[PDB]
Amino acid sequence: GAPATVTEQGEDITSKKDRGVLKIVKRVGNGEETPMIGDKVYVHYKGKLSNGKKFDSSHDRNEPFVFSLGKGQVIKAWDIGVATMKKGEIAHLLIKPEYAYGSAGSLPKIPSNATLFFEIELLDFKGE
Ligand SMILES: C=CC[C@@H](C(=O)N1CCCC[C@H]1C(=O)O[C@H](CCc1ccc(OC)c(OC)c1)c1cccc(OCC(=O)O)c1)c1ccc(Cl)s1
């Protein structure tokens, strides 16, 4: 499973090194530049529970998912994870609850203490 590969071979990109966010690069993006705090980022993604018992995908709006990086507009794992991504890159993230919704969850979609999995494609990013 794509999740299993991230467990075994994913890099811990957390500052605390608690394996709360693990990452594999599935397709290399271009150049060296990755986005700074405050950059506008454009992604496609899809996501599911570590189980997969729930599943959701941006693509259904053929328009990109857009947010300002590093400003708390998304769960912590995304501010951490998307920051490490290059233009055109596709990555897998496996995320412990503490970097997502925690024990609060986000019912009824996301239960308490849920692990999440995402495939993210970084389409572009532009400066504050
Ligand atoms: C419809 C389900 C939501 C989806 C999900 O978990 N996210 C959507 C993509 C981005 C990551 C993550 C997320 O940050 O959810 C957030 C949920 C709200 C939120 C934001 C910031 C948070 O912490 C700083 C936060 O903490 C619990 C929750 C989200 C959803 C939709 C849009 C958005 O920002 C752009 C905008 O507001 O226009 C942000 C999942 C998909 C599959 C899953 Cl399993 S979980």
From Swiss-Prot:
Result when mutating K16R: Decreased acetylation; promotes interaction with AKT1 and PHLPP1
Localization terms from the record: Cytoplasm; Nucleus
Induction section of the entry: By androgen.
Tissue: Widely expressed, enriched in testis compared to other tissues.
Domain annotation PPIase FKBP-type: ranges: 30-118
Location of N6-acetyllysine modifications: K16
Effect upon mutating K16Q: Mimics acetylation; impaired interaction with AKT1 and PHLPP1
Posttranslational modification: Acetylation impairs ability to promote interaction between Akt/AKT1 and PHLPP1. Deacetylation by SIRT7 promotes interaction between Akt/AKT1 and PHLPP1, leading to suppress Akt/AKT1 activation. Ubiquitinated, leading to degradation in a proteasome-dependent manner. Deubiquitinated by USP49, leading to stabilization.
Subunit (UniProt): Part of a heteromultimeric cytoplasmic complex with HSP90AA1, HSPA1A/HSPA1B and steroid receptors. Upon ligand binding dissociates from the complex and FKBP4 takes its place. Interacts with functionally mature heterooligomeric progesterone receptor complexes along with HSP90 and TEBP. Interacts with NR3C1. Interacts with Akt/AKT1 and PHLPP1; enhancing dephosphorylation and subsequent activation of Akt/AKT1. Interacts with IFI44L; this interaction modulates the kinase activity of IKBKB and IKBKE. Interacts with IKBKB and IKBKE.
Job description of the protein: Immunophilin protein with PPIase and co-chaperone activities. Component of unligated steroid receptors heterocomplexes through interaction with heat-shock protein 90 (HSP90). Plays a role in the intracellular trafficking of heterooligomeric forms of steroid hormone receptors maintaining the complex into the cytoplasm when unliganded. Acts as a regulator of Akt/AKT1 activity by promoting the interaction between Akt/AKT1 and PHLPP1, thereby enhancing dephosphorylation and subsequent activation of Akt/AKT1.
The name this protein goes by in its record: Peptidyl-prolyl cis-trans isomerase FKBP5
Organism: Homo sapiens
Species lineage: Eukaryota, Metazoa, Chordata, Craniata, Vertebrata
Span covered, complete protein: 16 to 140 of 457
